[PDB]
Design a protein around this ligand. Structure first.
Ligand SMILES: [Ca+2]
Ligand SMILES: [Ca+2]
Ligand SMILES: [Ca+2]
Ligand SMILES: [Ca+2]
Ligand SMILES: [Ca+2]
Ligand SMILES: [Ca+2]
Ligand SMILES: [Ca+2]
Ligand SMILES: [Ca+2]
Ligand code: NI
Ligand code: NI
Ligand code: NI
Ligand code: NI
Ligand code: NI
Ligand code: NI
Ligand code: NI
Ligand code: NI
Ligand code: NI
Ligand code: NI
Ligand code: NI
Ligand code: NI
Ligand code: NI
Ligand code: NI
Ligand code: NI
Ligand code: NI
Ligand code: NI
Ligand code: NI
Ligand code: NI
Ligand code: NI
Lengths: 172, 172, 172, 172, 172, 172
């Protein structure tokens, strides 16, 4: 038992390791999306920059959870980072839709983590999730929804013009 | 065939995808090491900072190879990022030794990549490797060797004093 | 024999004179394209500026090879600069496609020059080509491919709107 | 007929295309001279810089005439740029004499262009030539004459000392 | 075997020790030349400064190769630095000619070192030589050739005036 | 006889040439020591920096004596610079002891040079030695003695910790 450990359930510790993996996974999905838009036959530079920024953010999310694990005296166990479910993300609209789906999955995982913390009467963990993760997820989901809506209304993905102009005026 | 592709062998393209994976793997190993030294029962903050810096560097290495793949008209295929071979890195000396071994493995992979590029008469790829990777590897290996030597001479890993003082005066 | 000449094969010297001519030729093609977009019945000012910049760059490429010839003790022999294969470049998309083709031809010439240097065991010439020409060509080809892709996806050349908006938001 | 064309005779348009070619030719002659003085067995760096500056100026002359052609609604037709009449320019004095001869030939062409413009009652073209070309030519010819005179009086080309000192104190 | 050593042939290691000695030797030759021009019966202060600068440069060349040896895990073995082949360098022209000969000898040694590295499939060593030594040698040889040419054309070594004026206007 | 020579005995001139050689030799010993501490299996960076600084100082000592030789109208005759008596300097303490021995040998040579100058009634040479060399030697010897004392008291060379900490806190 860690000399610092206090009111930290083993289920919470395991859940934090799973969330670390999920955040690293999200980082990897976004990296893949980013360089898809860097392809010479896609060539939407601001889509690429947008998803690269997201990738680096998700890495920060993971590192803060690793720090949390050690803060509470839990022990980090890393697992493989699975490659994303696609190699070719099709279009700006499709990538944005996939990112929305991803962020809602991460959000669901965090809400389950919060539920667990509360069930185990761990207010420090509950508030850590509340303070550093829940509103970030709500903001990310809202932003992605906004982007999907505009791309759809503009005529994406069929209109290459639409994705070009969205890349310039929204993501640029 | 990509409209940009020229003098880029399919073996080179495959080799670049493998090197991307190896760089991401190195990034993950270093992340694991970093947070090992953040444990309350290890608590060497400058070892932790050193390996975290290395982790972020390796991520830059991977991203530059992904950019290269698209520059030459190859196609990125990501694979799982395997978890590191240890969860507990034992000591500062042991971690440094493991990092040395890792950098020499990455170096061997890059020398084979250069050999392939030269065999396929790809001077752009050969010089990309020469210019951006080979001396970086030699410098990294020399630095890690220096660190291992000093930690050994100081009495690590048995002397917790040695690793403490090395953390303060070399890594800090 | 020049007092400075050393390890410089006569075939390399001849090849450098041919590359000088090819760089001056590229400069001239780009000059022609530039002023095509300055026509009152074409009137895409940022296409014009883009190709004029390219023209001046190619002139720098030629001058650096002339300097190289004298550095190694070879002797410059200039040849006519052939007029470009078109007087009317049709459209922004068509010009970009022609520029892509041109840069790949120049690249092929440089890869053959590097192959020759290596065959004649001239590492100074090989590395001169590697360092100052090969990645510049890869970058130019990637950029032109990106531009072609976007113009195609936007609806060029049929959509005069597409080329107008690309001129404003990408080239401007 | 161009929508902008007004009071612009087809003979004037053709004459402007010929003058464009002559300006590009002058640029090429000066480029050749410049790198002749960069040879290790000539090695007069300020002669080289002087003629390189002249080369870039002549390119500006050509570009302004191309702009003029489009301003008036004429159509640019480029022709080959002939290689200069010498590969070896012999000496600083000889190069200066050849440049003087060249500038007087260009001047003669411009005076004929002005005569044509006036014959066709084209005061815009006449004044364009007057304002941007005629005094530039007179100044260039006077400067070259001054240089030839001094080099002759100093003992060039036989005195290598003379050309060395002129390179340092006049061209430097 | 050094813990850092990788893909570093014993022949390469020996060749690097020989090149270290040759660079120190060049430094010594230039030191000797420098103070020859400091003699009261020679008294060309800018020749003296020129060769002293060269001496210190060659020392930097040697130190970078010593660093390289340790970077690759080779072991430095120094040898005597032979005194130069002359005590009296005769004249500015003669010294410049001797320096040209010296730089071409050093260049030949470096080209053989590069050939060896390539034969032993050592791209890190090949590119180290390419990047830090080959163009430096080409530039040095061209500069010395230029100086020899001007001194000859001016009338050196018979004209003490020529060497005086060259010292003032080129080396000063 | 030099036009500047006055009250300068041939024995003094010869002695100055010997001292030039001894100063260059000291520079070389210190260069060797410096890069010994740059080895991956020694890796004391501040020992390396300390002896490199000493090497460059000794080179300044030699150059000032060469200047002196020409000031007095003597003639410089250089001799080989002998390689140092060791390739492997064992330890920080051992190197410091060897440097102390070296500086006392150089000092003995300078005291004999001063004795000679005084015997030949050469007060300019005597005071040159007094002013620029004797106290520098006393200071160097005292510093090296201080370093040896501290390294011994700390437990060097057996304590790798001692040399590490001395490198950090005294030489750094
Ligand atoms: Ca998998
Ligand atoms: Ca696995
Ligand atoms: Ca033709
Ligand atoms: Ca290279
Ligand atoms: Ca012709
Ligand atoms: Ca000898
Ligand atoms: Ca010896
Ligand atoms: Ca005194
Ligand atoms: Ni996010
Ligand atoms: Ni996240
Ligand atoms: Ni779903
Ligand atoms: Ni690294
Ligand atoms: Ni890496
Ligand atoms: Ni192993
Ligand atoms: Ni280009
Ligand atoms: Ni080019
Ligand atoms: Ni074709
Ligand atoms: Ni080869
Ligand atoms: Ni002119
Ligand atoms: Ni002109
Ligand atoms: Ni004539
Ligand atoms: Ni040099
Ligand atoms: Ni050198
Ligand atoms: Ni010879
Ligand atoms: Ni000293
Ligand atoms: Ni000394
Ligand atoms: Ni003794
Ligand atoms: Ni006395």
């Amino acid at each position: 038992t860690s000399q610092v450990r206090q009111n930290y359930h083993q289920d919470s510790e395991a859940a934090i390791n799973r969330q670390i993996n999920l955040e690293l996974y999200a980082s990897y999905v976004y990296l893949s999306m980013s360089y898809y838009f860097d392809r010479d036959d896609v060539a939407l530079k601001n889509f690429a920059k947008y998803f690269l920024h997201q990738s680096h953010e998700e890495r920060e999310h993971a590192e803060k959870l690793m720090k949390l694990q050690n803060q509470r005296g839990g022990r980090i166990f890393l697992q493989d980072i699975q490659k994303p479910d696609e190699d070719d993300w099709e279009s700006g609209l499709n990538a944005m839709e996939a990112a929305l789906h991803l962020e809602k999955n991460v959000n669901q995982s965090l809400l389950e983590l919060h539920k667990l913390a509360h069930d185990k009467n761990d207010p420090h963990l509950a508030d850590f999730i509340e303070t550093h993760y829940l509103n970030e997820q709500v903001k990310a989901i809202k932003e992605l929804g906004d982007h999907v809506t505009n791309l759809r209304k503009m005529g994406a993905p069929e209109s290459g013009l639409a994705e070009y102009l969205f890349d310039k005026h929204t993501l640029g």
